[PDB]
């Protein structure tokens, strides 16, 4: 059956909740066995595992702090130990940040880059080392990397700009194992992260309700609806299929046509 | 008769301007009439030569040692710049290191060596530049054609270190606009410096089978102008960006590769 992943094993970082959760469940729905990685959300990671088993596949939750490279190594070792091999690695874990350039601290730079950029880099490295030939790597960027310009969002935007460049060159190196490497760059996608910071993207964002701010994000797409975790999961599912092979080294912005 | 793009009365700071591209930028800003703070980390004698050259052109300059990987040293650098010359108008962030390696072999240490200078360092030079600059000032960072325009195997770490800078400058321009400071980056291709000898065998197909001279010739032929990029080429563009006449270029990354892309 075309676009399915039966017999494959996938790993998704930060798939206890948000976009990662949808990606994990969806890969399972396509027939992959799934390693659900989390850092803090233990109960949520188990719910996702349960859901993947319930729809007729298999899954395991594995804790790893993706800021710690030695834990990235162990994560992948434990993934292969449990399922025997690994075919698909989706790097999804990330954090958002806002602040005028003038007040960004060393600590905030390091908090953001350590996960969004450095972490994703080494997830890709360990994915290359552990993956079977013909495999798939997908990293997560953002529409703010290149397509969308938000005041006080320089740190985060840059953290994802590095990822865009990474994936283009990763595809050159990873080709000697016929592994494709791409990134998805979502726009505003309704998750905990969305509600945490939606007031930063709108003038006087604080004087609107959360619902209003979400509605306004909806109208930034010419389809007049919000992006949802499933929208990103749908695309990742195609990229990691056999049929996605000729998309390689690319960043796909997923904003419903906002840009 | 009209003379474009001069910087008389202005004060500029250039990171890593003891040698390479930074050296040509510093001298050129001096030639345009700016007083220049010549920052270096190791190249003391070269920094003094640049200082001397700027004084010879009829301007003034001072060399200040600072390791741009250390944010507290960036802060001191800019404090000392303003203390010496009274104000600062122009900040050019140029210091960087190159790296090569297949993804599979890149270590934590190599990631940190590259990013600490190329990305983090540049970010905080920009931060300190915004805090110290006069209104109407200029910030220019340094990216690379490998960020977006040129794809080189085993160059992922470096390419990404500069991809972050491209994104930084577009958003920096939004924040820095409350002091009417423009922020841009130059993204050179292969430019003949000490760093060129690192990159040259990777930037040509089968680069390893050629001599250094041959590689330089082959890099020349990657431009439709059939010559190499030189530090002066980048200096010429930075000079325009930091002039009054460059104001409407803001938030942009300008690839400088003689039309190779
Ligand atoms: N939603 C948007 O509007 C939007 C827009 C552009 C890009 N993105 C990107 O999409 C990705 C996911 O975003 P989201 O909306 O799902 O965010 P979210 O709701 O905040 O979820 C964050 C995810 O990252 C994981 N995570 C956080 N710290 C971690 C660490 N140290 N190690 C491992 N995992 C960690 C979390 O797991 P734990 O709870 O277990 O720590 C969680 O699964 C991020 O890369 C984000 O940059 C989102
Ligand atoms: N040459 C090229 O083909 C090329 C192409 C694309 C982009 N670039 C970029 O252009 C910029 C300048 O390159 P280049 O070709 O002039 O390289 P280069 O010839 O190797 O010179 C490097 C410069 O960076 C400075 N630097 C290194 N480490 C430093 C530190 N910790 N603190 C402060 N300064 C430091 C050096 O100063 P000290 O000697 O005092 O340490 C030196 O002035 C870099 O950002 C590079 O990434 C170059
Ligand atoms: O784009 C938005 C908006 C948004 C942008 C423009 C509008 O007119 C309204 C909302 C709100 O919250 C977010 C929250 C996010 O985490 C990411 C985003 O991209 C956005």
Break chain A into its structural domains and give their ranges. 1-259
- Closest among B7, B3, B2 to B138, alpha carbons compared: B7
Cα–Cα distance for residue pair B150/A68, rounded to 1 Å = 31
Cα–Cα distance for residue pair A120/A124, rounded to 1 Å = 6
| Shortest Cα–Cα distance, B45 to chain A (Å) | 31
Residue A24: HSE in the Cβ half-sphere, 13 Å Cα cutoff: 34
Cα–Cα distance for residue pair A109/B164, rounded to 1 Å = 12
Q: Is B159 a catalytic residue?
A: no
Find out whether A141 and A184 touch, Cβ atoms under 8 Å: yes
Q: Is A15 a catalytic residue?
A: no
**Is domain A1-259 classified as CATH 3.40.50.720?**
yes
Contact residues, A window 158-217, toward B, CB-based 8 Å cutoff: 158-166, 168-170, 172-174
Is the minimum distance from the CB of A188 to ligand 1 under 6 angstroms? yes
Residue A99: closest C-alpha in chain B? B175
Residues composing chain B = 261
Beta bridge partners of A89: A11, A137
Cα–Cα distance for residue pair B228/B219, rounded to 1 Å = 6
Contacts of B163 in chain A (CB under 8 A): 161-166
Buried-exposed string B121-155: b where 16+ CB fall within 10 A, e elsewhere:
bbbbbbbbbbebbbeebbbbbbbbbbbbebbbebb
Q: Could you tell me if B148 lies within 8 Å of chain A, comparing CB atoms?
A: yes
Place of tokens 């490279």: A69
* CA–CA–CA angle B77, B83, B85 (5° rounding): 100
Q: Which CATH superfamily is domain B1-261 in?
A: NAD(P)-binding Rossmann-like Domain (3.40.50.720)
DSSP letter at B133? P
Run of H or E including B45? helix B44-56
The answer to whether B163 contacts A162, with C-beta atoms less than 8 Å apart, is yes
Sign of the torsion angle spanned by Cα atoms B93, B97, B102, B103: negative
Rounded to 5, what percent of chain B is helix, strand, coil?
Answer: 50, 15, 35
Ligand 1 atom 20: the closest Cα is on which residue?
A: A193
Run of H or E including B183? strand B182-188
Residues composing chain A = 259
The answer to whether A172 contacts B163, with C-beta atoms less than 8 Å apart, is no
Atom of ligand 1 nearest to the CA of A190: 1
Phi, psi (rounded to 5 degrees) for A86 = -140, 130
Please return the burial class of A209, using the count of CB atoms within 10 Å of its CB with bins 0-12, 13-18 and 19+.
exposed
Please return the burial class of A173, using the count of CB atoms within 10 Å of its CB with bins 0-12, 13-18 and 19+.
buried
Contacts of B161 in chain A (CB under 8 A): 162
Please give the distance, rounded to the nearest whole angstrom, from the Cα atom of residue B234 to the centre of ligand 3. Answer: 37
Place of tokens 């410096």: B193
Find out whether A211 and A205 touch, Cβ atoms under 8 Å: no
Place of tokens 């600490």: B116
Q: How far apart are the first and last CA of chain B?
A: 37
Is the minimum distance from the CB of A244 to ligand 1 under 6 angstroms? no
Q: Could you tell me if B101 lies within 8 Å of chain A, comparing CB atoms?
A: no
The answer to whether A113 contacts B120, with C-beta atoms less than 8 Å apart, is yes
């Amino acid at each position: 059956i075309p676009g399915r992943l039966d017999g494959k094993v996938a790993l998704v970082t930060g798939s206890g909740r948000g976009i990662g959760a949808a990606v994990a469940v969806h890969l399972g729905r396509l027939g992959a066995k799934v390693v659900v990685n989390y850092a803090n959300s233990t109960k949520d990671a188990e719910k996702v595992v349960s859901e993947i088993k319930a729809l007729g596949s298999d899954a395991i939750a594995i804790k790893a702090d993706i800021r710690q490279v030695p834990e990235i190594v162990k994560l992948f070792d434990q993934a292969v130990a449990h399922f025997g091999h690994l075919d698909i690695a989706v790097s999804n874990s990330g954090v958002v940040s806002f602040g005028h350039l003038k007040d960004v601290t060393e600590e905030e730079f390091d908090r953001v880059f350590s996960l969004n950029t450095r972490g994703q880099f080494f997830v890709a490295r360990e994915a290359y080392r552990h993956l079977t030939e013909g495999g798939r790597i997908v990293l997560t960027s953002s529409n703010t990397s290149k397509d969308f310009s938000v005041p006080k969002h320089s740190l985060y935007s840059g953290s994802k700009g590095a990822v865009d460049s990474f994936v283009r060159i990763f595809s050159k190196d990873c080709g000697d194992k016929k592994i494709t490497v791409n990134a998805v760059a979502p726009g505003g996608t309704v998750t905990d992260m969305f509600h945490e910071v939606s007031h930063h993207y709108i003038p006087n964002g604080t004087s609107y309700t959360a619902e209003q701010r979400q509605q306004m994000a909806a109208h930034a797409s010419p389809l007049h609806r919000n992006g949802w975790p499933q929208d990103v999961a749908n695309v990742v599912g195609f990229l990691v299929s056999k049929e996605g092979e000729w998309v390689n080294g690319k960043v796909l912005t997923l904003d419903g046509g906002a840009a």
